[PDB]
Write an enzyme that holds these catalytic residues in place. Sequence first.
Site, mmCIF file in Angstrom:
data_model
loop_
_atom_site.group_PDB
_atom_site.id
_atom_site.type_symbol
_atom_site.label_atom_id
_atom_site.label_comp_id
_atom_site.label_asym_id
_atom_site.label_seq_id
_atom_site.Cartn_x
_atom_site.Cartn_y
_atom_site.Cartn_z
ATOM 1 N N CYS A 315 0.808 -1.225 0.000
ATOM 2 C CA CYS A 315 0.000 0.000 0.000
ATOM 3 C C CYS A 315 0.837 1.269 0.000
ATOM 4 C CB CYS A 315 -0.868 0.012 1.250
ATOM 5 S SG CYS A 315 -2.059 -1.349 1.283
ATOM 6 N N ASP A 316 2.140 1.114 -0.116
ATOM 7 C CA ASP A 316 3.032 2.207 -0.109
ATOM 8 C C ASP A 316 3.376 2.574 -1.549
ATOM 9 O OD1 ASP A 316 5.052 3.946 0.454
ATOM 10 O OD2 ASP A 316 5.870 2.640 2.000
#
Lengths: 381, 381
Positions: A315-316
């Site tokens: 999710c980065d």
Amino acid sequence: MKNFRLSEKEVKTLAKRIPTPFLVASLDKVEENYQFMRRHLPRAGVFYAMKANPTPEILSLLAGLGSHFDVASAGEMEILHELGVDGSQMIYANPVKDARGLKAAADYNVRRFTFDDPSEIDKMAKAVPGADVLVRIAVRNTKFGAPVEEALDLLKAAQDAGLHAMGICFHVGSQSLSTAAYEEALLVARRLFDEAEEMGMHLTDLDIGGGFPVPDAKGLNVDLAAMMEAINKQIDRLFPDTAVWTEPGRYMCGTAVNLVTSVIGTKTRGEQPWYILDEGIYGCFSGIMYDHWTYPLHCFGKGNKKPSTFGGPSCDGIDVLYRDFMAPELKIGDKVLVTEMGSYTSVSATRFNGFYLAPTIIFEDQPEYAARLTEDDDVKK
Amino acid sequence: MKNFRLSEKEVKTLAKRIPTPFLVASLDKVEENYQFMRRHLPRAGVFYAMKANPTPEILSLLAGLGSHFDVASAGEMEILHELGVDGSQMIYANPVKDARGLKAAADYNVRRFTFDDPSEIDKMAKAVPGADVLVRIAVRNTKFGAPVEEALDLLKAAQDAGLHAMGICFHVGSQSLSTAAYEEALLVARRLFDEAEEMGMHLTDLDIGGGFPVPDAKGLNVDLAAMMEAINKQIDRLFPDTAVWTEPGRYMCGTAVNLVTSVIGTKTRGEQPWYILDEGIYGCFSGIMYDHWTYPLHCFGKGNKKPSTFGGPSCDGIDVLYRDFMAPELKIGDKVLVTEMGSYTSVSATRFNGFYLAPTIIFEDQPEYAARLTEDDDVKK
Ligand SMILES: Cc1ncc(COP(=O)(O)O)c(C=O)c1O
Ligand SMILES: Cc1ncc(COP(=O)(O)O)c(C=O)c1O
Ligand SMILES: [Mg+2]
Ligand SMILES: [Mg+2]
Ligand code: NA
Ligand code: NA
Ligand code: NA
Ligand code: NA
């Protein structure tokens, strides 16, 4: 001279049984790499720098081939210890040591140490009273290595504290392309060795470190047999007297491991398609960050290729692996193959976002290897 | 408004019992951070973005306070599951999901999902036939989020596949300083919400994501109560109808954890002294690499300060933490303290060089906390 490489068909069968991502390591290639080194650099004993890849099966095999091990912490000593490697096969080659690591070196009878600072001398002395030490000197190609003028003083200071001043070591830097640095550094050490004898100090061992290259996304410029024979020759030319050692890390296992990862999402927004994979910058592709590395990726596609972006499952927004990469059209559930994945890869993987570490499957325990063996026994004879 | 901070004396006593490096986390501060959010942003339900810090005691406490959890993989779901958190308290908020993660969402009855691509719709549909989904839209402040014009089409396409189109989500980006983006993004979502109702689609939930700031080496510019009351007000102004959620990650635990690390080597070569610590860029200081972060370090020294370099315990030349840092003279065995260490720190630590992961000690289980409590019950009444 082959890199270990799964065929497309091997990727299909493996991925039917083992959920992606996973790594596949060939012990045969690790053996071949070791033996190749012993053949072209016979003068150099081998301290496998296990920091590159600590897979236990890999360590058991090298131990069995008579390799020694360069250990950099208590944990590296501990895993060797559970495989029945004794402290006499180890060098504690981290120039700056913690308490746990000195304890472990003491408990497992590790008796060879490297160091580059005066402050290090009393730690070692208390911990392992009689002990061989090599001074690390800083050569050319910051954090590590003593300046060349301090070297003899550091060894003398080490003798005054009851440690045995055994020799000198260095490291040219990782991924070396030219032999010059190895031969420069060998000369620098030659001077020091002479200066020491006349000083009433007799040095017995030289450790030339690692840095032997591995192929990357663009491949390998160098011929390794030559490179090694050259440096072997200039060892013979310079150090007839002396016991010499090397600390390969990357070389030993880099070309012996593949990563298999599935495409799990597509982003055909345009202009460029994004392929999201199930292994990412927080796992095996961590070497992009810590090792400035670019890995060879193989997409298995019939169609014409096109500039494509690859990212990881997290999710980065930092989790982007390739940009402008020429790739055919892929769909969710396709496998891609990444080769030359054995070094400084899984050793920096994390469980960021709760992902599991990709496991390492020993290829020689699989039917795909049996299939390669039955194919080879028929065709060759 | 205090950051959790061990005194010098607390560091001495803790370090007598627990070998460095180790992390110290205060549950009270995690509670205080949660309650502060609930007080100043009462309109927003809380999905703790556990990717920032997954310590089980921290998760058990938040679950007990009634927090919900944003999960990004099977492993995050799995650890929640062993703490007795049910799938109904979770959102599977990774826009691109793997097979393992869809299985786990199915097995634990997770029924809320986010997504930003058409390809994602069939994965979700097969896996969790009746299921609430929010479309993620890309706002201002690449890898994630659908363009604002695709948003309604992605929700309709999701209904045609039998999923319940529940709402919209976004994320402004991590470490946000101004409220503008939150209020811009709230408007953008307002438009979409109107456009949807008239379209015969009624959206019930809004998820405004995370990004609330934490103090770094230079501290915090923003006043958080205001920031939160502002955004709470503009939620009230814009979304009287609607169930709103937030996904704090960094905010919840960042100011609740300290790292304690020992100096294990010195390099007084000059001009600048190097202090080598026992925690490094491959452990907790990994946020320097993946989170572009600069942590506040506290050296506990009487003498005048001087520009100093800090590095980590590993053998890699990348393991340098601070440069030109104004520090007093330290010796081997001194402790330094690093504050604001609870987020995107230990979650990216590794066992590179065989080092052990630094463990997280719950402060409230320690006598130092009992000592703080006896000091507080005497002075306050
Ligand atoms: C002492 C020593 N030798 C060898 C190596 C490995 O070098 P390479 O992996 O580049 O061969 C390292 C790690 O950087 C090391 O610290
Ligand atoms: C959906 C979602 N929400 C929240 C967060 C956490 O944001 P922050 O830690 O900046 O508050 C993340 C992680 O980046 C995320 O993917
Ligand atoms: Mg981890
Ligand atoms: Mg690891
Ligand atoms: Na054994
Ligand atoms: Na290849
Ligand atoms: Na329980
Ligand atoms: Na502070």
